[PDB]
Structure 1
Protein backbone atom coordinates (compact mmCIF):
# COMPACT_ATOMS: atom_id res chain seq x y z
CA UNK A 1 0.00 0.00 0.00
CA UNK A 2 0.91 3.71 -0.45
CA UNK A 3 -0.18 6.26 2.20
CA UNK A 4 1.19 9.83 2.59
CA UNK A 5 -0.08 12.44 5.04
CA UNK A 6 0.77 16.05 4.47
CA UNK A 7 -0.55 18.48 7.14
CA UNK A 8 0.49 21.44 5.00
CA UNK A 9 -1.82 20.26 2.26
CA UNK A 10 -1.45 23.64 0.56
CA UNK A 11 2.00 22.53 -0.79
CA UNK A 12 0.18 20.02 -3.03
CA UNK A 13 -2.37 22.59 -4.26
CA UNK A 14 0.50 24.93 -5.29
CA UNK A 15 2.39 22.10 -6.99
CA UNK A 16 -0.61 21.27 -9.10
CA UNK A 17 -1.10 24.97 -9.91
CA UNK A 18 2.65 25.03 -10.92
CA UNK A 19 2.32 22.03 -13.24
CA UNK A 20 -1.17 21.61 -14.71
CA UNK A 21 -0.93 24.28 -17.44
CA UNK A 22 2.48 23.06 -18.65
CA UNK A 23 1.79 19.31 -18.85
CA UNK A 24 -1.43 17.36 -19.31
CA UNK A 25 -0.39 14.04 -17.85
CA UNK A 26 2.59 12.55 -16.07
CA UNK A 27 3.84 9.63 -14.00
CA UNK A 28 4.14 10.15 -10.34
CA UNK A 29 6.86 7.74 -9.26
CA UNK A 30 6.20 6.72 -5.72
CA UNK A 31 8.85 4.87 -3.68
CA UNK A 32 10.30 4.77 -0.14
CA UNK A 33 12.34 7.90 -0.94
CA UNK A 34 9.28 9.93 -1.62
CA UNK A 35 7.36 11.27 -4.60
CA UNK A 36 9.18 12.04 -7.84
CA UNK A 37 7.74 13.39 -11.13
CA UNK A 38 9.68 13.97 -14.28
CA UNK A 39 8.07 14.99 -17.57
CA UNK A 40 8.75 16.96 -20.70
CA UNK A 41 6.09 19.34 -21.92
CA UNK A 42 4.42 18.33 -25.21
CA UNK A 43 6.80 20.30 -27.37
CA UNK A 44 9.85 18.72 -25.66
CA UNK A 45 11.40 22.15 -25.24
CA UNK A 46 11.10 21.99 -21.41
CA UNK A 47 11.27 19.43 -18.60
CA UNK A 48 9.83 19.57 -15.10
CA UNK A 49 11.20 17.69 -12.10
CA UNK A 50 9.41 17.51 -8.77
CA UNK A 51 10.88 16.04 -5.58
CA UNK A 52 8.78 15.49 -2.41
CA UNK A 53 10.93 13.46 -0.02
CA UNK A 54 9.15 11.03 2.34
CA UNK A 55 10.51 12.83 5.42
CA UNK A 56 8.50 15.98 4.49
CA UNK A 57 5.27 14.10 5.00
CA UNK A 58 3.92 13.70 8.48
CA UNK A 59 3.42 10.02 7.74
CA UNK A 60 4.69 8.01 4.77
CA UNK A 61 4.39 4.38 3.77
CA UNK A 62 5.32 2.86 0.43
CA UNK A 63 5.32 -0.95 0.39
CA UNK A 64 6.22 -1.18 -3.29
CA UNK A 65 7.43 1.11 -6.03
CA UNK A 66 4.69 2.55 -8.19
CA UNK A 67 4.27 4.60 -11.34
CA UNK A 68 0.93 6.42 -11.16
CA UNK A 69 -0.21 7.82 -14.54
CA UNK A 70 -2.11 10.98 -13.75
CA UNK A 71 -4.22 13.50 -15.73
CA UNK A 72 -3.01 16.74 -14.17
CA UNK A 73 -6.16 18.70 -14.97
CA UNK A 74 -8.22 16.09 -13.08
CA UNK A 75 -5.84 16.09 -10.10
CA UNK A 76 -6.07 19.94 -10.04
CA UNK A 77 -9.86 19.97 -9.99
CA UNK A 78 -9.68 17.56 -7.07
CA UNK A 79 -7.14 19.71 -5.27
CA UNK A 80 -9.26 22.93 -5.75
CA UNK A 81 -11.77 21.19 -3.42
CA UNK A 82 -9.18 21.36 -0.63
CA UNK A 83 -9.01 24.37 1.58
CA UNK A 84 -5.64 26.01 2.10
CA UNK A 85 -5.39 24.75 5.69
CA UNK A 86 -6.46 21.13 5.01
CA UNK A 87 -4.46 18.10 5.98
CA UNK A 88 -4.27 16.04 2.77
CA UNK A 89 -3.83 12.27 2.69
CA UNK A 90 -2.84 10.42 -0.51
CA UNK A 91 -3.49 6.69 -0.66
CA UNK A 92 -3.23 3.91 -3.30
CA UNK A 93 -3.36 0.12 -3.31
CA UNK A 94 -0.45 -1.89 -4.77
CA UNK A 95 -0.68 -1.73 -8.53
CA UNK A 96 -3.29 0.99 -8.04
CA UNK A 97 -6.05 1.76 -10.63
CA UNK A 98 -7.15 4.81 -8.65
CA UNK A 99 -5.71 7.33 -6.12
CA UNK A 100 -7.56 8.36 -3.01
CA UNK A 101 -7.22 11.89 -1.77
CA UNK A 102 -8.80 12.66 1.66
CA UNK A 103 -9.02 16.27 2.92
CA UNK A 104 -9.47 16.98 6.66
CA UNK A 105 -10.48 20.50 7.66
CA UNK A 106 -8.60 21.01 10.94
CA UNK A 107 -10.89 23.65 12.46
CA UNK A 108 -14.14 22.43 10.88
CA UNK A 109 -15.78 18.96 11.23
CA UNK A 110 -15.68 18.21 7.50
CA UNK A 111 -13.96 15.35 5.57
CA UNK A 112 -13.81 15.04 1.82
CA UNK A 113 -12.79 11.84 0.03
CA UNK A 114 -12.01 11.91 -3.64
CA UNK A 115 -11.08 9.01 -5.87
CA UNK A 116 -9.05 9.75 -9.03
CA UNK A 117 -8.89 7.39 -12.04
CA UNK A 118 -5.34 6.71 -13.18
CA UNK A 119 -4.13 6.48 -16.75
CA UNK A 120 -1.87 3.80 -18.23
CA UNK A 121 1.12 5.77 -19.50
CA UNK A 122 4.03 4.42 -21.52
CA UNK A 123 7.17 5.35 -19.53
CA UNK A 124 10.31 6.53 -21.42
CA UNK A 125 12.33 8.31 -18.65
CA UNK A 126 15.85 9.49 -19.54
CA UNK A 127 18.38 10.61 -16.96
CA UNK A 128 19.04 14.29 -16.35
CA UNK A 129 22.80 15.00 -16.35
CA UNK A 130 24.54 15.88 -13.07
CA UNK A 131 26.66 19.01 -13.46
CA UNK A 132 27.79 22.31 -12.06
CA UNK A 133 27.21 25.68 -13.71
CA UNK A 134 29.10 28.77 -14.86
CA UNK A 135 26.59 31.11 -13.14
CA UNK A 136 24.07 30.51 -10.41
CA UNK A 137 21.78 33.45 -9.64
CA UNK A 138 19.64 33.52 -6.54
CA UNK A 139 17.03 36.20 -6.46
CA UNK A 140 13.53 36.95 -5.19
CA UNK A 141 10.86 34.86 -6.95
CA UNK A 142 8.37 37.78 -7.34
CA UNK A 143 11.08 39.82 -9.10
CA UNK A 144 11.87 37.12 -11.56
CA UNK A 145 8.13 36.65 -12.26
CA UNK A 146 7.66 40.39 -12.91
CA UNK A 147 10.83 40.68 -15.07
CA UNK A 148 9.66 37.73 -17.28
CA UNK A 149 6.14 39.12 -17.53
CA UNK A 150 7.25 42.65 -18.42
CA UNK A 151 9.87 41.67 -20.99
CA UNK A 152 7.30 39.34 -22.71
CA UNK A 153 5.43 42.54 -23.54
CA UNK A 154 8.45 43.72 -25.52
CA UNK A 155 9.72 40.49 -27.12
CA UNK A 156 9.62 36.67 -27.45
CA UNK A 157 13.13 35.93 -26.19
CA UNK A 158 15.08 36.91 -23.08
CA UNK A 159 18.82 37.40 -23.30
CA UNK A 160 20.13 36.60 -19.82
CA UNK A 161 23.52 38.12 -19.25
CA UNK A 162 25.42 37.60 -16.06
CA UNK A 163 28.70 38.93 -14.54
CA UNK A 164 30.19 38.89 -11.00
CA UNK A 165 28.41 42.05 -9.81
CA UNK A 166 25.01 41.89 -11.57
CA UNK A 167 22.56 40.14 -13.91
CA UNK A 168 20.86 41.60 -16.95
CA UNK A 169 17.68 40.52 -18.74
CA UNK A 170 17.06 41.89 -22.28
CA UNK A 171 14.20 41.59 -24.81
CA UNK A 172 13.66 43.07 -28.25
CA UNK A 173 10.65 43.18 -30.60
CA UNK A 174 8.68 45.30 -33.06
CA UNK A 175 7.98 48.20 -30.73
CA UNK A 176 11.58 48.50 -29.48
CA UNK A 177 13.76 46.89 -26.82
CA UNK A 178 14.30 46.73 -23.07
CA UNK A 179 16.78 45.62 -20.45
CA UNK A 180 16.54 45.21 -16.71
CA UNK A 181 19.72 45.31 -14.68
CA UNK A 182 19.83 43.94 -11.13
CA UNK A 183 22.83 44.58 -8.89
CA UNK A 184 24.17 41.94 -6.51
CA UNK A 185 22.97 42.90 -3.07
CA UNK A 186 23.93 42.70 0.68
CA UNK A 187 18.65 39.51 -1.90
CA UNK A 188 20.33 39.09 -5.28
CA UNK A 189 23.33 36.74 -5.14
CA UNK A 190 25.66 35.64 -7.95
CA UNK A 191 28.05 32.68 -7.78
CA UNK A 192 29.99 32.79 -11.00
CA UNK A 193 32.87 30.67 -12.39
CA UNK A 194 32.53 32.57 -15.68
CA UNK A 195 30.14 35.02 -17.48
CA UNK A 196 27.29 33.78 -19.65
CA UNK A 197 25.07 35.38 -22.22
CA UNK A 198 22.21 33.02 -23.05
CA UNK A 199 18.86 33.31 -24.83
CA UNK A 200 15.55 31.71 -23.89
CA UNK A 201 11.81 31.59 -24.75
CA UNK A 202 9.76 33.82 -22.42
CA UNK A 203 6.61 31.85 -23.17
CA UNK A 204 8.00 28.87 -21.22
CA UNK A 205 9.49 31.04 -18.45
CA UNK A 206 6.20 32.70 -17.68
CA UNK A 207 4.89 29.20 -17.14
CA UNK A 208 7.64 28.26 -14.76
CA UNK A 209 6.78 31.33 -12.62
CA UNK A 210 3.41 29.83 -11.69
CA UNK A 211 5.51 28.03 -9.04
CA UNK A 212 6.21 31.41 -7.39
CA UNK A 213 3.87 30.72 -4.44
CA UNK A 214 6.12 27.76 -3.39
CA UNK A 215 9.03 29.99 -2.42
CA UNK A 216 10.04 33.58 -1.96
CA UNK A 217 13.22 32.84 -3.79
CA UNK A 218 14.15 31.22 -7.09
CA UNK A 219 17.60 30.17 -8.44
CA UNK A 220 18.79 30.29 -12.01
CA UNK A 221 21.64 27.97 -13.05
CA UNK A 222 23.21 28.42 -16.44
CA UNK A 223 26.06 27.44 -18.77
CA UNK A 224 26.77 27.74 -22.47
CA UNK A 225 25.35 24.78 -24.53
CA UNK A 226 23.01 23.48 -21.77
CA UNK A 227 19.46 24.01 -20.44
CA UNK A 228 18.53 26.74 -17.97
CA UNK A 229 17.48 25.37 -14.61
CA UNK A 230 14.86 27.41 -12.68
CA UNK A 231 14.51 25.88 -9.27
CA UNK A 232 11.95 26.50 -6.60
CA UNK A 233 12.54 25.05 -3.08
CA UNK A 234 9.55 23.41 -1.39
CA UNK A 235 10.87 24.15 2.07
CA UNK A 236 12.12 21.28 4.11
CA UNK A 237 10.89 18.69 1.66
CA UNK A 238 11.93 19.01 -1.98
CA UNK A 239 11.87 21.30 -4.98
CA UNK A 240 10.49 21.96 -8.39
CA UNK A 241 13.03 22.26 -11.19
CA UNK A 242 12.18 23.40 -14.63
CA UNK A 243 14.72 22.89 -17.41
CA UNK A 244 14.62 25.02 -20.56
CA UNK A 245 16.50 24.22 -23.75
CA UNK A 246 18.34 27.24 -25.13
CA UNK A 247 16.55 29.15 -27.88
CA UNK A 248 17.86 28.43 -31.37
CA UNK A 249 16.57 30.54 -34.31
Structure 2
Protein backbone atom coordinates (compact mmCIF):
# COMPACT_ATOMS: atom_id res chain seq x y z
CA UNK A 1 0.00 0.00 0.00
CA UNK A 2 0.61 3.55 -1.19
CA UNK A 3 -1.28 6.56 0.23
CA UNK A 4 0.27 10.03 -0.15
CA UNK A 5 -1.39 13.20 1.11
CA UNK A 6 -0.80 16.57 -0.52
CA UNK A 7 -2.21 19.66 1.20
CA UNK A 8 -1.33 21.70 -1.94
CA UNK A 9 -3.75 19.97 -4.32
CA UNK A 10 -3.30 22.81 -6.79
CA UNK A 11 0.19 21.39 -7.37
CA UNK A 12 -1.16 18.14 -8.83
CA UNK A 13 -3.77 20.15 -10.72
CA UNK A 14 -1.07 22.34 -12.29
CA UNK A 15 1.29 19.46 -13.10
CA UNK A 16 -1.43 17.60 -15.00
CA UNK A 17 -2.55 20.78 -16.75
CA UNK A 18 1.06 21.17 -17.88
CA UNK A 19 1.59 17.65 -19.19
CA UNK A 20 -1.95 16.85 -20.41
CA UNK A 21 -1.34 17.97 -24.00
CA UNK A 22 2.44 17.38 -23.98
CA UNK A 23 2.27 13.61 -23.51
CA UNK A 24 -0.81 11.40 -23.55
CA UNK A 25 0.52 8.46 -21.54
CA UNK A 26 3.23 8.34 -18.90
CA UNK A 27 4.62 5.97 -16.29
CA UNK A 28 4.46 7.58 -12.88
CA UNK A 29 7.06 5.72 -10.90
CA UNK A 30 6.23 5.65 -7.17
CA UNK A 31 9.03 5.08 -4.69
CA UNK A 32 10.18 5.48 -1.11
CA UNK A 33 11.79 8.79 -2.10
CA UNK A 34 8.76 10.15 -3.94
CA UNK A 35 6.98 10.38 -7.29
CA UNK A 36 8.97 10.40 -10.53
CA UNK A 37 7.93 10.73 -14.18
CA UNK A 38 10.29 10.56 -17.16
CA UNK A 39 8.93 10.62 -20.68
CA UNK A 40 9.40 11.77 -24.25
CA UNK A 41 6.66 13.82 -25.88
CA UNK A 42 4.27 12.11 -28.29
CA UNK A 43 6.43 13.24 -31.24
CA UNK A 44 9.58 12.20 -29.32
CA UNK A 45 11.46 15.52 -29.41
CA UNK A 46 11.35 17.04 -25.93
CA UNK A 47 11.85 15.15 -22.68
CA UNK A 48 9.81 15.70 -19.50
CA UNK A 49 11.04 14.88 -16.00
CA UNK A 50 8.81 15.42 -12.95
CA UNK A 51 10.04 14.83 -9.40
CA UNK A 52 7.96 15.12 -6.22
CA UNK A 53 9.50 14.16 -2.88
CA UNK A 54 8.16 12.28 0.15
CA UNK A 55 9.09 15.21 2.33
CA UNK A 56 6.84 17.55 0.38
CA UNK A 57 3.66 15.58 1.01
CA UNK A 58 1.97 16.13 4.35
CA UNK A 59 1.76 12.33 4.56
CA UNK A 60 3.66 9.81 2.46
CA UNK A 61 3.87 6.03 2.52
CA UNK A 62 4.85 3.45 -0.07
CA UNK A 63 5.23 -0.22 0.88
CA UNK A 64 5.97 -1.45 -2.67
CA UNK A 65 7.57 0.44 -5.56
CA UNK A 66 4.94 1.08 -8.20
CA UNK A 67 5.10 1.68 -11.97
CA UNK A 68 1.74 3.15 -13.03
CA UNK A 69 1.01 3.81 -16.67
CA UNK A 70 -1.50 6.66 -16.60
CA UNK A 71 -3.46 8.41 -19.33
CA UNK A 72 -2.41 12.01 -18.79
CA UNK A 73 -5.66 13.26 -20.28
CA UNK A 74 -7.94 11.13 -18.09
CA UNK A 75 -6.03 12.13 -14.96
CA UNK A 76 -6.37 15.73 -16.12
CA UNK A 77 -10.13 15.23 -16.29
CA UNK A 78 -10.37 13.65 -12.84
CA UNK A 79 -8.24 16.35 -11.19
CA UNK A 80 -10.19 19.15 -12.88
CA UNK A 81 -13.00 18.11 -10.50
CA UNK A 82 -10.84 19.36 -7.61
CA UNK A 83 -10.97 22.84 -6.14
CA UNK A 84 -7.72 24.81 -6.11
CA UNK A 85 -7.69 24.60 -2.30
CA UNK A 86 -8.66 20.93 -1.83
CA UNK A 87 -6.39 18.43 -0.08
CA UNK A 88 -5.87 15.86 -2.82
CA UNK A 89 -4.90 12.46 -1.50
CA UNK A 90 -3.59 9.77 -3.82
CA UNK A 91 -3.88 6.10 -2.94
CA UNK A 92 -3.26 2.67 -4.46
CA UNK A 93 -3.27 -1.02 -3.53
CA UNK A 94 -0.53 -3.20 -5.07
CA UNK A 95 -2.48 -2.04 -8.40
CA UNK A 96 -5.27 -1.99 -11.00
CA UNK A 97 -6.64 1.54 -10.41
CA UNK A 98 -5.53 4.81 -8.82
CA UNK A 99 -7.74 6.41 -6.17
CA UNK A 100 -7.92 10.17 -5.69
CA UNK A 101 -9.56 11.96 -2.76
CA UNK A 102 -10.29 15.68 -2.89
CA UNK A 103 -11.08 17.37 0.44
CA UNK A 104 -12.23 20.97 0.20
CA UNK A 105 -11.19 22.65 3.47
CA UNK A 106 -13.69 24.57 5.59
CA UNK A 107 -16.53 22.87 3.70
CA UNK A 108 -18.06 19.44 4.26
CA UNK A 109 -17.32 18.23 0.73
CA UNK A 110 -15.34 15.07 -0.01
CA UNK A 111 -14.66 13.62 -3.46
CA UNK A 112 -13.51 10.06 -4.11
CA UNK A 113 -12.54 8.99 -7.64
CA UNK A 114 -10.95 5.91 -9.21
CA UNK A 115 -8.96 6.15 -12.43
CA UNK A 116 -8.57 3.10 -14.63
CA UNK A 117 -4.86 2.54 -14.90
CA UNK A 118 -2.63 1.43 -17.75
CA UNK A 119 0.03 -1.17 -18.44
CA UNK A 120 3.05 0.84 -19.62
CA UNK A 121 6.75 0.22 -19.74
CA UNK A 122 13.60 4.03 -18.53
CA UNK A 123 15.94 6.66 -19.96
CA UNK A 124 19.06 8.60 -19.07
CA UNK A 125 19.43 12.16 -17.79
CA UNK A 126 23.04 12.78 -16.66
CA UNK A 127 23.28 15.71 -14.26
CA UNK A 128 25.95 17.83 -15.89
CA UNK A 129 27.37 21.32 -15.70
CA UNK A 130 25.93 23.91 -18.08
CA UNK A 131 27.76 26.76 -19.80
CA UNK A 132 25.13 29.36 -18.95
CA UNK A 133 22.15 29.39 -16.59
CA UNK A 134 19.52 32.14 -16.73
CA UNK A 135 17.08 32.35 -13.81
CA UNK A 136 14.45 34.71 -15.12
CA UNK A 137 10.77 35.14 -14.20
CA UNK A 138 8.25 32.58 -15.43
CA UNK A 139 5.78 35.16 -16.73
CA UNK A 140 8.44 36.93 -18.76
CA UNK A 141 9.84 33.77 -20.36
CA UNK A 142 6.27 32.80 -21.26
CA UNK A 143 5.49 36.24 -22.70
CA UNK A 144 8.69 36.31 -24.74
CA UNK A 145 8.11 32.91 -26.34
CA UNK A 146 4.42 33.65 -27.02
CA UNK A 147 5.25 36.92 -28.77
CA UNK A 148 8.09 35.50 -30.87
CA UNK A 149 5.84 32.60 -31.85
CA UNK A 150 4.04 35.06 -34.18
CA UNK A 151 7.20 36.01 -36.12
CA UNK A 152 8.98 32.71 -36.76
CA UNK A 153 8.84 29.00 -36.04
CA UNK A 154 12.21 28.91 -34.23
CA UNK A 155 13.99 30.99 -31.60
CA UNK A 156 17.67 31.98 -31.34
CA UNK A 157 18.80 32.35 -27.73
CA UNK A 158 22.11 34.18 -27.28
CA UNK A 159 23.79 34.58 -23.91
CA UNK A 160 26.78 36.22 -22.19
CA UNK A 161 27.54 38.03 -18.94
CA UNK A 162 25.79 41.27 -20.02
CA UNK A 163 22.34 39.92 -20.88
CA UNK A 164 20.28 37.46 -22.87
CA UNK A 165 18.79 38.10 -26.33
CA UNK A 166 16.07 36.05 -28.00
CA UNK A 167 15.69 36.49 -31.75
CA UNK A 168 13.37 35.29 -34.49
CA UNK A 169 12.65 35.89 -38.16
CA UNK A 170 9.91 34.90 -40.56
CA UNK A 171 8.11 35.84 -43.74
CA UNK A 172 6.54 38.80 -41.92
CA UNK A 173 9.68 40.40 -40.52
CA UNK A 174 12.42 40.26 -37.91
CA UNK A 175 12.49 40.56 -34.12
CA UNK A 176 14.82 40.93 -31.11
CA UNK A 177 14.32 40.83 -27.32
CA UNK A 178 17.14 42.00 -25.03
CA UNK A 179 17.07 41.35 -21.27
CA UNK A 180 19.79 42.81 -19.04
CA UNK A 181 21.37 41.41 -15.88
CA UNK A 182 19.59 43.13 -13.00
CA UNK A 183 15.24 44.09 -5.54
CA UNK A 184 12.58 41.40 -5.11
CA UNK A 185 12.79 37.89 -6.60
CA UNK A 186 11.66 39.08 -10.04
CA UNK A 187 15.01 39.63 -11.72
CA UNK A 188 17.32 38.15 -14.36
CA UNK A 189 20.63 36.55 -13.34
CA UNK A 190 22.89 35.30 -16.12
CA UNK A 191 25.86 33.32 -14.85
CA UNK A 192 27.34 32.52 -18.26
CA UNK A 193 30.85 31.08 -18.52
CA UNK A 194 31.07 30.41 -22.28
CA UNK A 195 29.76 31.90 -25.55
CA UNK A 196 26.43 30.07 -25.87
CA UNK A 197 24.26 30.54 -28.97
CA UNK A 198 21.49 28.01 -29.57
CA UNK A 199 18.43 27.61 -31.80
CA UNK A 200 15.27 25.87 -30.60
CA UNK A 201 11.67 25.22 -31.68
CA UNK A 202 9.04 27.65 -30.36
CA UNK A 203 6.24 25.08 -30.63
CA UNK A 204 7.89 22.96 -27.94
CA UNK A 205 9.13 25.87 -25.83
CA UNK A 206 5.51 27.07 -25.73
CA UNK A 207 4.47 23.57 -24.68
CA UNK A 208 7.03 23.85 -21.86
CA UNK A 209 5.69 27.24 -20.76
CA UNK A 210 2.43 25.73 -19.40
CA UNK A 211 4.17 24.77 -16.14
CA UNK A 212 4.34 28.52 -15.48
CA UNK A 213 1.61 28.55 -12.76
CA UNK A 214 3.98 26.40 -10.66
CA UNK A 215 6.88 28.84 -10.18
CA UNK A 216 7.41 32.59 -10.32
CA UNK A 217 10.84 31.98 -11.89
CA UNK A 218 12.28 29.55 -14.43
CA UNK A 219 15.85 28.51 -15.12
CA UNK A 220 17.29 27.91 -18.59
CA UNK A 221 20.45 25.78 -18.68
CA UNK A 222 22.53 25.31 -21.79
CA UNK A 223 25.84 24.48 -23.50
CA UNK A 224 27.04 23.71 -27.03
CA UNK A 225 25.27 20.74 -28.66
CA UNK A 226 23.48 19.84 -25.46
CA UNK A 227 19.70 19.73 -24.87
CA UNK A 228 18.43 22.91 -23.23
CA UNK A 229 16.89 22.46 -19.77
CA UNK A 230 13.90 24.58 -18.71
CA UNK A 231 13.19 23.88 -15.05
CA UNK A 232 10.29 25.06 -12.92
CA UNK A 233 10.82 24.36 -9.23
CA UNK A 234 7.69 23.33 -7.38
CA UNK A 235 8.10 24.27 -3.72
CA UNK A 236 9.35 21.98 -1.07
CA UNK A 237 8.63 19.42 -3.78
CA UNK A 238 11.20 18.88 -6.46
CA UNK A 239 10.81 20.09 -9.99
CA UNK A 240 9.37 19.78 -13.52
CA UNK A 241 12.28 19.85 -15.98
CA UNK A 242 11.89 20.07 -19.76
CA UNK A 243 14.65 19.04 -22.20
CA UNK A 244 14.91 20.20 -25.82
CA UNK A 245 17.77 19.63 -28.19
CA UNK A 246 18.50 22.51 -30.57
CA UNK A 247 17.93 21.85 -34.24
CA UNK A 248 21.07 20.81 -36.11
CA UNK A 249 21.20 18.66 -39.23
TM range (shorter): over 0.9
Kindly state the Cα deviation for residue 107 of structure 1 after the two structures are TM-superposed.
1.3
Distance 2:221 2:125 in 1: 14
Distance 2:50 2:224 in 1: 24
Question: Is the 1:166–1:184 contact (alpha carbons within 8 Å) kept by the matching residues of 2?
Answer: yes
Equivalent pairs counted in the alignment come to 246
Q: For each residue in 1:182-216, what CA deviation from the matched residue of structure 2 results, as whole angstroms up to 9, or x when unmatched?
A: 00009000111112010000000001010000000
Alignment RMSD, CA only? 0.9
Distance 1:43 1:248 in 2: 17
User: Which residue matches 1:83?
Assistant: 83
* SS, match of residue 43 in structure 1: coil
Distance 1:17 1:68 in 2: 19
Question: Is the 2:151–2:168 contact (alpha carbons within 8 Å) kept by the matching residues of 1?
Answer: yes
Kindly state the Cα deviation for residue 246 of structure 1 after the two structures are TM-superposed.
0.9
Question: Is the 2:160–2:193 contact (alpha carbons within 8 Å) kept by the matching residues of 1?
Answer: no
Runs of 4+ in 1 over 2 A off after TM superposition: none
Distance 1:82 1:9 in 2: 8
Distance 1:143 1:17 in 2: 20
Distance 2:126 2:42 in 1: 21
Distance 1:129 1:44 in 2: 18
Kindly state the Cα deviation for residue 248 of structure 1 after the two structures are TM-superposed.
2.5
Distance 2:16 2:244 in 1: 19
Question: Is the 1:30–1:65 contact (alpha carbons within 8 Å) kept by the matching residues of 2?
Answer: yes
Question: Is the 1:164–1:195 contact (alpha carbons within 8 Å) kept by the matching residues of 2?
Answer: no
Kindly state the Cα deviation for residue 154 of structure 1 after the two structures are TM-superposed.
0.2
Q: For each residue in 1:4-43, what CA deviation from the matched residue of structure 2 results, as whole angstroms up to 9, or x when unmatched?
A: 0001111000000111110000000000000000000022
Distance 2:42 2:98 in 1: 24
Identify, as 1 or 2, the structure richer in strand: 1
* SS, match of residue 149 in structure 2: helix
* SS, match of residue 236 in structure 2: coil
* SS, match of residue 143 in structure 1: helix
Give me the TM-score of the superposition, normalised by structure 1: 0.97
Distance 1:195 1:163 in 2: 6
Kindly state the Cα deviation for residue 236 of structure 1 after the two structures are TM-superposed.
1.1
* SS, match of residue 247 in structure 2: coil
Unmatched runs of 5 consecutive residues or more in structure 2: none
Unmatched runs of 5 consecutive residues or more in structure 1: none
User: Which residue matches 2:203?
Assistant: 203
Distance 2:246 2:96 in 1: 38
Q: Matches of residues 188-227 of structure 1 in structure 2 within 5 Å?
A: 188-227=188-227
